[PDB]
Design a protein around this ligand. Sequence first.
Ligand code: CA
Ligand code: CA
Lengths: 702, 733
Amino acid sequence: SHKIDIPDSAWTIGIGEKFKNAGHPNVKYPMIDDSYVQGAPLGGFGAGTIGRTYNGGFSRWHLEIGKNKYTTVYANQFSVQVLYAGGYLSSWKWDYPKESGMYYALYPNSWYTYTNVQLAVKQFSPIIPYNYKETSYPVAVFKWTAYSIMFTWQNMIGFNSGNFDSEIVVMGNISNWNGEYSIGVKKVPGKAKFVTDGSDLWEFSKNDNKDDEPTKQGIGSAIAVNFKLQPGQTIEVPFALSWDLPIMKFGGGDKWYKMYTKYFGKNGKNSFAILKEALNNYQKWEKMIDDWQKPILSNKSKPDWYKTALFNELYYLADGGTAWENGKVGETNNMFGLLECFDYNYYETLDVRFYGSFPLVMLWPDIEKQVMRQFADTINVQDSSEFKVGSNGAMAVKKVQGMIPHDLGSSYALPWIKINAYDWQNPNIWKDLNSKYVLLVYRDYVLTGKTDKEFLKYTWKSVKTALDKLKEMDKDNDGIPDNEGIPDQTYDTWSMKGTSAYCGSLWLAALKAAQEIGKVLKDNEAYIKYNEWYKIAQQNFEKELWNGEYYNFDTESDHKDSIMADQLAGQWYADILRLGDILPKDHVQKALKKIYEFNVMKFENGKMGAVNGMRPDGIVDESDIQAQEVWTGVTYALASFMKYRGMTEEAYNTAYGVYKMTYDKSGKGYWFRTPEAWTKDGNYRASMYMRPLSIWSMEVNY
Amino acid sequence: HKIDIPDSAWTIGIGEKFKNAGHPNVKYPMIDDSYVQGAPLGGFGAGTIGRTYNGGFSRWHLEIGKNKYTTVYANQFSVFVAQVLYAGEPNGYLSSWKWDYPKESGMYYALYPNSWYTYTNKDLPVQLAVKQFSPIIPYNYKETSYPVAVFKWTAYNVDVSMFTWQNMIGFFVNSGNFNKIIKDDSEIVAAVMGNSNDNEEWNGEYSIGVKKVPGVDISYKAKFVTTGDGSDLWHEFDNKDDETPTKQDGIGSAIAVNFKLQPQTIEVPFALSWDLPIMKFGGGDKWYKMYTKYFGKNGKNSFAILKEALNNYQKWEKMIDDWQKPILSNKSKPDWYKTALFNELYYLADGGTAWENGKVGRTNNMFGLLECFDYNYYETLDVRFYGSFPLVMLWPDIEKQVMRQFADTINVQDSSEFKVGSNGAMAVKKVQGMIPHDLGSSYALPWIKINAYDWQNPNIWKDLNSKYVLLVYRDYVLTGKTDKEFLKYTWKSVKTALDKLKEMDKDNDGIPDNEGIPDQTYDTWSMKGTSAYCGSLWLAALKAAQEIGKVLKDNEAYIKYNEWYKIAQQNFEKELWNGEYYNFDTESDHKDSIMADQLAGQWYADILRLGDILPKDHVQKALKKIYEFNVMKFENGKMGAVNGMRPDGIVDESDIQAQEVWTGVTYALASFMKYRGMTEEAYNTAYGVYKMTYDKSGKGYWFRTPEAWTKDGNYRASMYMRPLSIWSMEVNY
Ligand SMILES: [Ca+2]
Ligand SMILES: [Ca+2]
């Protein structure tokens, strides 16, 4: 009751609190909306994860990789009266009282405090920067603190028929979807088979002791802690949950072992081995967590809201249907993938990770460079089977040689094997992907010391190919690839034509970045070529687009003089990659002030982020729905650029609107499901999105 | 629930206890009114009333210059179950009323000048929330002086019902007191608790009241015994009049509203006024308060005032909100900083503030803020050097008036001797050429008898004459470099000030000589030889005087001060710069102490755009050294910057001053860190002062931020002017 840790910057909500302003999808096609009843997830990378919500319920199951089932498995609780703020199991005391406890989260930690004796728990999994071991585990620790505490848990094998010093006291299947869940507890100085009516386990209500050791049609266990509290006294018991579900399968066939198998084995009967390791070591884990968080949490110049966003946004690295493979079932690297989101069910969407992958480069760089090499490998893959383009019904080659793919597949097909699952447009003619690929490769070198010349060696052929193919898309001999007057980049319904601010700046930065790689690898043929291309392109970019107050959207559209939030995407990266000024400081500082004055300040009073497109007359551009959207990950990326350029006030005001909408009492209730986009009414599109992880680009220090 | 309380409001629950509150750390007498305080009500120079977080009107600064902490229990708001909204019990009197408003049932919120109460009890199904304030407004020298306090209530099928207020007349005991009842494109009903028709300190009238608003109906008792069991009023929750003079029994009024509310939100403003137009000081002088300029001097205008408020209050909320917006809308700045920035301004009204509009039982209106109550001294120059930032920045016409008062006193010679407290010796009261230590005490004669302070002899201080010159130029600079008149008026004082300090350079190194005896604000800590502190202050003052000399075309002076500066700067660097910091001084035992204030001259040189008196690289390293030592090695950086740290990382133990954190000095240090790109260090440094003052884990000095604390967190001199220096963090470049 205020003895526990609980940092100031933790996101807080009353247990059982209703939220009367939650936004909904602003599109009519199929889209997830699990509502506002969410919490920080539990799970390592690749392990599948479990959303325990602020109401108590274990409600949001990503255990099946790449998929999202939202249902409260009501048998899973901690009971004192049951701690859940809300048919079967009728004998339990449900509707836990309101104005009677709180939830706090600062990912990877969260906490509950119950104050109707008074209790508090700290739940977390060992998500720790620069640690590729514990971070993989399918484990959660629940460190209770009292100043009768029972963990019940359903047998979720088949989510039925066929299911069974140190001091610590396992559900499964008769076969040898198969695996085990184990709960448990540890002895500090102080049942077995339920029917999921529930009077069987609920007595209990004063304070069975039965140890059964199989069914055919609602099994489930329970594990209690009994003690008397001498007044003034405060004890503490560590609980835990594990899940050995070692195989993931994807709609198309392939079955794979999860990453935690490397440490606990592929067998699927190692749940207790995992959960024990948890209960004997969580002390050392808390510490490792605190130690990485301290530098930011103690820098009292930064507002508490920005800490809240920064840390909790990390929920998605584990929660984005994340796949980390330790060999295929059947039979020297462990391939990795994060979903763009669950609605657009694509792994590693490259035009999005350009923004979204900052937490991996900065905090788990070995994973990052792995994913970049996966993209290196695909670049020359040719697949001439045709597909139907969703936007216009054109036929097109699936994968063209020398073109970076949009994605590396779908949980509904064959991740890592069948790439370009995306079909709304043809990514083989996108003008941003090949640029962005170069930029990511060089960023991943620069943000890891400038020492991994092996990484540059592996990717260098791909890099040179990527830009050689783009150069061929220059129709008008200006040295820049021409946008085709359809959406051929991440803004996949907003047409760009001729030369765009966006695709052009990325091409400038990509050419500069290849130049530097050129130097580092003693390759003067590529160095000279890219600098000659660079000088022609820069002169013309600048002539074509600079209008004296900002860079024009493009040279050839009817909306060519729209103010685009992301006009200087190239320069933003160039600052990060220490390539210096590909555009004049004066023009950049002018464009940034323009975007803040127009796209932020003239859109819902600067309280909702940066809308993508604004007309010179200060009215939102209506040429495309995307122009009328704030993209959370673009806004955050914009704030980082403003921060580096010394527009500090403007940076944080820009980024506050995203925080607010997401987390604040006056927002739209997107905590732990941050969407790609919202429109001016606050309604959203594509919750649980990769892009807004870009907030970590604000922590890039110089 | 349906009201815009800002995020940065300081907040505590009503009736909440505080376990780890600090107390005096000295053996001599010292005020300690405990942690139960809140934002004060009242304008500059009107007297102030501190309604605490528990609801009581309990800290009485209406006798200008004094602080009476006693709860006047008949002064309350009550909700009709029937309950007085005050988390406490009245010994005896007023016993029939419902006391002990319950714990864990309501919140106090403060972001000065506004403060809020929200009441949410099980047994009061109708929810209530009140926002109180007085119209403290920058660049306004009118409403900002009103002795007035609006209370904007807000409730949200039941019919909720009372503002009770004892006749305070004779509280600074009861004879001749009568309660009249006024009824007035608006409809207002008011009590007026008055008295006799003399121009004396104690006479005048209080007054409470309310504005109609459709849906609410106004009742009114008008002569409750306050020295009774209170049944006279408690029974009926009458509507009687009773203009009948009381004699030995203390009387009191009571306004109310009845309203009917359906499953709707009602907004009813009540309000308080007080016309005590005359302030008497201890040595006899009697003055009119500033608000008398706008409402008159006779002491019977309490209703007029109260009317102006209830008619114009919404206009005042917009004025306040308009001035707070640029800071609140800035989301780069943390909330705690905003909480400190605004609530520290409480002190401009709370600090014995005195602002005159004629002697009883004249083109100008003299002004004066107390150093604090314990050391009862108006405008202590050392302290205003740090603490006057909110005045130059938000109320610059007051600021210039105060500096004209100093310019007119530098020539004063009072050859009489007085006994020096610290050592018994006799010294001249006031030497001509030397700026005075202060402009008097409220126990004597403010503005008329200066240098009331006597613990040391300030006529040999080596810092105040420089500080004065720096203040003058600051005031010119922070008001747009346009006010040549001000400089013309103060120019002779400046040249005298500097010329007098120069005569104390007895070793001919260009810098005035600290003498080992008390001769600057760190009096017991002691300096000798050339000091970083007095020395840096001197270099910047010369630098300032050159600029004024350019601006006013005094070439003879510009040349002279330039000459002195060049010679002084060189020796300052030779004598004190060690490569990591500037040494404390050249001849003391503690000469290698790292002092938090070592570069005070350069801090003001930045604010004055005077350029580098010291090289950037040196300044940068000195500030690193101070953060790394004086902050980070003093209670792990969570309590401010300790004044003195030895080279080996141990606090300088030579004097109690070296082991204190001075709050005003720490905030100034943070601003200086902030100016020079040490943003993290700056806010980490200022943060510890906020923790101590405002946070669950501090020592509970909200609305009484002290001069200092030691490592245990206990304090010296609560209600201190110096922490207003936090506004120096808001200087724009
Ligand atoms: Ca072109
Ligand atoms: Ca000297």
